[PDB]
Amino acid sequence: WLTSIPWGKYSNENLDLARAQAVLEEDHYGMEDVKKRILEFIAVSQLRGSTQGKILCFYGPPGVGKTSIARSIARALNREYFRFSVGGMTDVAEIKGHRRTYVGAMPGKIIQCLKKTKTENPLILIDEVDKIGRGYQGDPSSALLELLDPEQNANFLDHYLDVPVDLSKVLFICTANVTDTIPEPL
Amino acid sequence: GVGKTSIARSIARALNREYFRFSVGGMTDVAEIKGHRRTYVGAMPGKIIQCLKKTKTENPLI
Amino acid sequence: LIDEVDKIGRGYQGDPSSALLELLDPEQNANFLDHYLDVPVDLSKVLFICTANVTDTIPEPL
Amino acid sequence: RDRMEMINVSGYVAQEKLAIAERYLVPQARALCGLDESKAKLSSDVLTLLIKQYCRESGVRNLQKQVEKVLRKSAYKIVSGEAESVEVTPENLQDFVGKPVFTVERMYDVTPPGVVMGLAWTAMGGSTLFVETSLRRPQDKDAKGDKDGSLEVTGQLGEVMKESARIAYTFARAFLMQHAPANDYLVTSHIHLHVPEGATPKDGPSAGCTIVTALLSLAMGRPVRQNLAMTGEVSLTGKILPVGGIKEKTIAAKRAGVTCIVLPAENKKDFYDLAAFITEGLEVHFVEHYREIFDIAFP
Amino acid sequence: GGSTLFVETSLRRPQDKDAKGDKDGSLEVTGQLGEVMKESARIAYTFARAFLMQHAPANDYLVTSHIHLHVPEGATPKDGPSAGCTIVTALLSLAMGRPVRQNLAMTGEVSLTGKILPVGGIKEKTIAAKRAGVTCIVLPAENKKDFYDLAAFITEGLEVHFVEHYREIFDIAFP
Ligand SMILES: Nc1ncnc2c1ncn2[C@@H]1O[C@H](COP(=O)(O)OP(=O)(O)O)[C@@H](O)[C@H]1O
Ligand SMILES: Nc1ncnc2c1ncn2[C@@H]1O[C@H](COP(=O)(O)OP(=O)(O)O)[C@@H](O)[C@H]1O
């Protein structure tokens, strides 16, 4: 599990602006606010040398194309795509794993993302963020904030693999049909 | 947005003792601060112990 | 052929509705894996059939 | 609570916010975006406009978001646009941040009868909450009717707030009979008042005094003097009581444009502890008995 | 998304309990009332009573008559109060029995004196209104600028209206 995690491997990121703009325009009509926002992100990341992964949360009615645009952004920016569902989720272990001393412990699902993606800077998509319950024994919102924490992500560690892992270049995305029920700290 | 935690971080730097932020608001289970009995499969110590371990110092600024 | 889909309780320690959503997912099924055999398996050609006595109690994402 | 001493870290005024932005936030965001100082120019006038119109709150993070947005847009226009160095001017600002949301407005500039401002120390900073009063059922229940004007408080009343409102109503009745016995409108008329929420319960009674004067206005239909605020607590006798968190209420009043702030006499010293630069342009008042307020608000 | 919810009101018990009876017209609110919704409805009721007093003191129907109103659910709690403005005019319409001018959508927040306040989600409501075919949309003056951010092609065929004091609305709904 440990040696299967990519280390120092950074998938090449596209820097051409016209090519990315055309790619995005050929995938989703209109929606020009998101397109211009991502264009501005690409430009600023290119100007400031290395590319950082900043978080943003799309929100609107359902079926509008929020997952499809996430996939289109992943394709256009040239980085790896991955989807993840958190709506109504209660067992933080799915994101943290287990102590590894169990008879059949597993690591968090984010380490599975890193392993399958084979890259340390993929595009992780979070789905139905506002549906988190944070109920009894759960409260995955704390770990989720840890993921979005601008600095702790650079040294995030899971219970199974406790070695800190950098998550600054990962480009998180969140989707929710309403901004009310989402916790304020998030 | 007044920088209360920011001034805390600045005080930690100036005083030269190690810094560490802690969010207790909304915490429900005290076991996070107290860990578990260590006999349960997966039992882990309190979060303050982890803070002490990571900070590597016995006099940090929690 | 899944049967009595709407009767799923999705209760404590369980929530098999998430596993169903994974299975019925048009694309994730193509690389579905279980905890025993973790190797991904393709399930794009399998033609699932769901039977329920009413459409209300069935989960909306499902 | 009793196990430690508490210092009051509180927000910054528009001038302090502008200084914070220009000297610390702007270079920090510029470095976090990589743009050169000469390449991107942000005049202090643009920062002042942004603070005044867009980011209005005790906190500062929103201004950080706005500056990040404009810097990102400048980087976008530099990398592939036409200008090698974006000169952010107010006229251009409209395109970068869009049209100004949170446009400056006092909720009631006229302040018709039965409504008045009040500096409420809310959970996040302080606000200039508007207490409203209005007749809700005809005074002519009966030409000979002696039924009292039962009041219907609203705005998520707290039992403490209910008792404070009842005390304020009783004191207002007593004052009205003391001044003009002939007048009996408030004595026998059912009146509905609304006190906007957001004020922490501890500071809830701090607006009670306002209630009183509002009612008095509705009694005589005289609008309160323009851009006048006040706060404190009454003890059924007009003896105003001190209130806490004066700095946040003062800064909120300064931002709202209200010029006259009336405070309990005891709080006077606490108001002078505040920095001088925050107290310019306001005609502060200090009182202990409510009577004086009635004269000032109704000359 | 956005929806065109039909708020409605009607008499639910005779106004003539007694020709001399001065009992107030207690109001019953349904539609899974929320505490904030209940308080907003009470505020709207009081403001409607005051407005009818100011305009036509002769009429006292709304003053003394038990009225039931239905506000269909679906609105999220945060924007729940937004429908309150409609409630007001509804009562006023029921007070005079004059039907509101056809295909006239509106929304806003009343503050017990008529000074309307801004509301959120303006774009969703605008698109829903366009889908419903309504031609006149009455919105708070504060939100005016926000409605102009909408792409051009979505705003055709509608006579938008901007207002801050509810008085203006009463002059548009009831000519
Ligand atoms: N430009 C577009 N305009 C409208 N719909 C689109 C566009 N591009 C893709 N879609 C549709 O959007 C759907 C995805 O819905 P989505 O908004 O991702 O749901 P969710 O709210 O669960 O994320 C797809 O079925 C696709 O057909
Ligand atoms: N006086 C100041 N000068 C410069 N920057 C400040 C000042 N006060 C606050 N900030 C900045 O604004 C942000 C405020 O966040 P903060 O108030 O610490 O969060 P919280 O409200 O959760 O404690 C900080 O990132 C800090 O850098």
Numbering used by the authors:
A (entry chain D): 464 to 649
B (entry chain F): 526 to 587
C (entry chain A): 588 to 649
D (entry chain F): 650 to 948
E (entry chain D): 774 to 948
What does the paper say about this structure?
One of them, ATP-dependent protease Lon, is a member of the AAA+ family (ATPase associated with various cellular activities) and is responsible for selective degradation of unfolded, oxidatively damaged, and short-lived regulatory proteins, which prevents their toxic aggregation. Functional hLon is structurally organized into homo-oligomers consisting of six identical subunits.
Other hLon mutants were produced by exchanging Tyr186 and Tyr394 for glutamates (Y186E; Y394E), thereby mimicking the negative charge introduced by phosphorylation (hereafter “phosphorylation-mimicking” hLon variants), or for phenylalanines (Y186F; Y394F), which acted as non-phosphorylatable controls (these mutations were introduced to verify that the effects of phosphorylation were not due to the loss of functionality occasioned by the removal of the Tyr hydroxyl group). The same approach was also used to study TFAM and the most significant digestion delay was observed in the reaction with Y186E, where more than half of the protein substrate remained undigested. Cryo-EM maps were obtained for Y186E, Y186F, pCMF186, Y394E, and Y394F with resolutions ranging from 2.9 to 8.5 Å (based on the 0.143 cut-off of the Fourier shell correlation curve). ADP could be clearly resolved in the Y394E, Y186E, and Y394F structures. Structurally, only the pCMF394 substitution had a large impact: the cryo-EM structures of the ADP-bound forms of the Y186E, Y186F, pCMF186, Y394E and Y394F mutants were all very similar, while the pCMF394 substitution destabilized the formation of the ATPase-protease hexamer. Phosphorylation of Tyr186 would therefore place an additional negative charge on a large group in the middle of this cleft, which could force the subdomains apart, thereby interfering with the proper binding and recognition of Lon substrates.
